[PDB]
Design a protein around this ligand. Structure first.
Ligand SMILES: *[C@@H]1O[C@H](CO)[C@@H](O)[C@H](O)[C@H]1NC(C)=O
Ligand SMILES: *[C@@H]1O[C@H](CO)[C@@H](O)[C@H](O)[C@H]1NC(C)=O
Ligand SMILES: *[C@@H]1O[C@H](CO)[C@@H](O)[C@H](O)[C@H]1NC(C)=O
Ligand SMILES: *[C@@H]1O[C@H](CO)[C@@H](O)[C@H](O)[C@H]1NC(C)=O
Ligand SMILES: *[C@@H]1O[C@H](CO)[C@@H](O)[C@H](O)[C@H]1NC(C)=O
Ligand SMILES: *[C@@H]1O[C@H](CO)[C@@H](O)[C@H](O)[C@H]1NC(C)=O
Ligand SMILES: *[C@@H]1O[C@H](CO)[C@@H](O)[C@H](O)[C@H]1NC(C)=O
Ligand SMILES: *[C@@H]1O[C@H](CO)[C@@H](O)[C@H](O)[C@H]1NC(C)=O
Lengths: 404, 128, 187
């Protein structure tokens, strides 16, 4: 069976990249204003230093993630002003002048769908303005320059002409693009409409990170109130109702109990950070290959044959649009491994032999385009007798009229 | 997380007040001067601000650039073809192992006491 | 270093060094004092192991990456953009380092450039001609076909191009003459 039509499809993929940078002061969490709490804590020593050497390890990693997904480029490309892209209407995904932050429409439709006792929250190094600036460069690069701006200096090429190369990479001949340019553009511009619809309806991968990294802090602050088996949870009460020579044991218990909860929370941070790192690396490799190139890697860049991708920014994460080629509407055919001619066995150079029971033809593998069999489509390498399934026929010669 | 109005109340000798002070979203930055130019990020501060040491030598803090800028010459009938090339060599660094540490928990906790061992068998398997 | 310093912490016991307690106090009082140091020391030891397990778990990912990069960059060329270094990839030479490995990647980079006019196809005897591999470029007067990555022009032969359909459908096309190299010799 050989397919005879196709549909361009656009598919969506969503990835987390950073959790919120946070920090805790060991002493302001464990103690109130009590000095004796501090002086008893000084009996335990170094733990209140390691807990910051731990959390600061996470805080810098959360920069180096966002730094490394996005900064593949050092040259902010302007978009051309004239939107001549041969029928493609990217106005959904480009930035626009009027918005109070220069996020695209597809980004603003997205941004909406996502929602003290020493606890401190540190801003990120990059702002959402800087992030959205970078992605506007990756769009401008890929639309005007193909892959070349990834490999080196950016070489301009017409968009409707680069699509021919992207088709050539999947074994479809360029005539199949140029004879159909109008129809293909309509399929594309239609599919972007479904993304606006579907996005308007789904961010669970992103949304639940914001949930868990709040919920753990709520657990940590609630855990202040526990008695831990002390006589009460307020240090002033301990220090007033009982003399220090014995209130010492109550304080020592309540410090030990509280400390255990911080010593757990810091590990429940680290083990998550170690998963977000694996996600940032996967997103980095997806961007390096599927956006700045074209990749043969089956189903790595979304379902189907891959053509191109566009990145779009999101809070704490990134979203891709993968544009893919899907074959459809196929017909059955008779086939044979080889043709027998004047006693000698012909094989096709690239395509495959088919017959509609009535005539014999050769056609490329992935899009029905039958042709006359010639000694220029084929090469010869033996007698007919040796290969199974050979079929007798005749090979036309364009050099035969050239007898004159 | 301190408004610059409040910073003097805790105070380091010069920088109590009376000095260059620069409010930022990251906080109150003092002892460095703001500049309208932009550069690459020498040292990070936060929220798009980076700091550097510069020549009169002083510390300056500035909105970091994202690098340079240029347009791309795009027409619907024109193309650019390279006429020359250069080979290049680059190094990538990867870690592969760390030290094989090993620790004897009985020696560490108890030294050479026997009694400290006789206590430790209250706790069971941990030293295994 | 942190783990050795933790031996000096007293955890509310009378003294840091057990031999001080175990000398100056009798068993039924020592046995309620030494009990604290053990709990303090264990918890410092427990924390250390939980750190080593995570750093091991992350180095394992780096070593597993390096083995992927060696197989796909040294024992062969690979076309994964930016995997074997920036640019187009030619070969790589490994070198060793203390606890590590260091690659040298060898990469080709296109450099000088010139602008040209170009057109999707040639319209000939009412028949369109497409290039087999290169792209058509004009220097503003003559029309050539050239390979994509390095300017090296050629005449529009009957044998670089192939034909498919009439001139009517292709949006951009320029009328131009295709050359048959057999035409003289065939006489
Ligand atoms: C292929 O699909 C397109 C879009 O639905 C349609 O316009 C065209 O007529 C179809 N052609 C065939 C071979 O059915
Ligand atoms: C195809 O299979 C049938 C049934 O096994 C057999 O009779 C026939 O000879 C085969 N033909 C080819 C092309 O080998
Ligand atoms: C092709 O013709 C030859 C000679 O007549 C014959 O031996 C052979 O069986 C034929 N093969 C087929 C596939 O008809
Ligand atoms: C700092 O305090 C002044 C006076 O109340 C106020 O006008 C200003 O907005 C404050 N700035 C910040 C960063 O809160
Ligand atoms: C480019 O677009 C303009 C406006 O549609 C058109 O006049 C011109 O012929 C086009 N050039 C080519 C060769 O595509
Ligand atoms: C290409 O670059 C090489 C090395 O710099 C130089 O020797 C040579 O002249 C250049 N050739 C062209 C065509 O620019
Ligand atoms: C284009 O190249 C040909 C090479 O033979 C030359 O004769 C012609 O003058 C060139 N034209 C322009 C405008 O550069
Ligand atoms: C090519 O010639 C035909 C017939 O004269 C004409 O209609 C068409 O516009 C010409 N195209 C160009 C690009 O000169």
């Amino acid at each position: 069976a050989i397919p005879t039509n196709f549909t361009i499809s656009v598919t969506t993929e969503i990835l987390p990249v950073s959790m919120t940078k946070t920090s805790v002061d060991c002493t302001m969490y464990i103690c109130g204003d009590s000095t004796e709490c501090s002086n008893l804590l000084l009996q335990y020593g170094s733990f209140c230093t390691q807990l910051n050497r731990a959390l600061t390890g996470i805080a810098v990693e959360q920069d180096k993630n966002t730094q490394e997904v996005f900064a593949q480029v050092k040259q902010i490309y302007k978009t051309p002003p004239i939107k001549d892209f041969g029928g493609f209407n990217f106005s959904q995904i480009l930035p626009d002048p009027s918005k109070p932050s220069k996020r695209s429409f597809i980004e603003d439709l997205l941004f909406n769908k996502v929602t003290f006792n020493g606890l401190t929250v540190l801003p990120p190094l990059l702002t959402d303005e800087m992030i959205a600036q970078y992605t506007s460069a990756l769009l401008a690069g890929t639309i005007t320059s193909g892959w070349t701006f990834g490999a080196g200096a950016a070489l301009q090429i017409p968009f409707a002409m680069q699509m021919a190369y992207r088709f050539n990479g999947i074994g479809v001949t360029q005539n199949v693009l140029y004879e159909n340019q109008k129809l293909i553009a309509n399929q594309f511009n239609s599919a972007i409409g479904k993304i606006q619809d579907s996005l308007s309806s789904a961010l669970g991968k992103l949304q639940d990170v914001v949930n868990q990294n709040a919920q753990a802090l709520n657990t940590l602050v609630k855990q202040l109130s526990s008695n831990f088996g002390a006589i009460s949870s307020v240090l002033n009460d301990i220090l007033s109702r009982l003399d220090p020579p014995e209130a010492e044991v109550q304080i020592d218990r309540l410090i030990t109990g509280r400390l255990q909860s911080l010593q757990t929370y810091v590990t429940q941070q680290l083990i998550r950070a170690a998963e977000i790192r694996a996600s940032a690396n996967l997103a980095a490799t997806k961007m390096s290959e599927c956006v700045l190139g074209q990749s043969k890697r089956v189903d790595f860049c979304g379902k189907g044959y891959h053509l191109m991708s566009f990145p779009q920014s999101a809070p704490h994460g990134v979203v891709f649009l993968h544009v893919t080629y899907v074959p459809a509407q196929e017909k059955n055919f008779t086939t044979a491994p080889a043709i027998c001619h004047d006693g000698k066995a012909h094989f096709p150079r690239e395509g495959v032999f088919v017959s509609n029971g009535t005539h014999w033809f050769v056609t490329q593998r992935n899009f029905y385009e039958p042709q006359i069999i010639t000694t220029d489509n084929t090469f010869v390498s033996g007698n007919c007798d040796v290969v199974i399934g050979i079929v007798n026929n005749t090979v036309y010669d364009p050099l035969q009229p050239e007898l004159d | 997380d301190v408004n610059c109005t409040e910073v003097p109340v805790a105070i380091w000798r010069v920088y109590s007040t009376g000095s260059n002070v620069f409010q930022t979203r990251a906080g109150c930055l003092i002892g460095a001067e703001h500049v309208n130019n932009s550069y690459e990020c020498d040292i990070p501060i936060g929220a798009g601000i980076c700091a550097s040491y510069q020549t009169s030598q002083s510390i300056i803090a500035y909105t970091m650039s994202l690098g340079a800028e240029n347009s791309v010459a795009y027409s619907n009938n024109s193309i650019a073809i390279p006429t020359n090339f250069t080979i290049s060599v680059t190094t990538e660094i990867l870690p592969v192992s760390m030290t094989k540490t090993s620790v004897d928990c009985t020696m560490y906790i108890c030294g050479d006491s026997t009694e400290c061992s006789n206590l430790l068998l209250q706790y069971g398997s941990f030293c295994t």
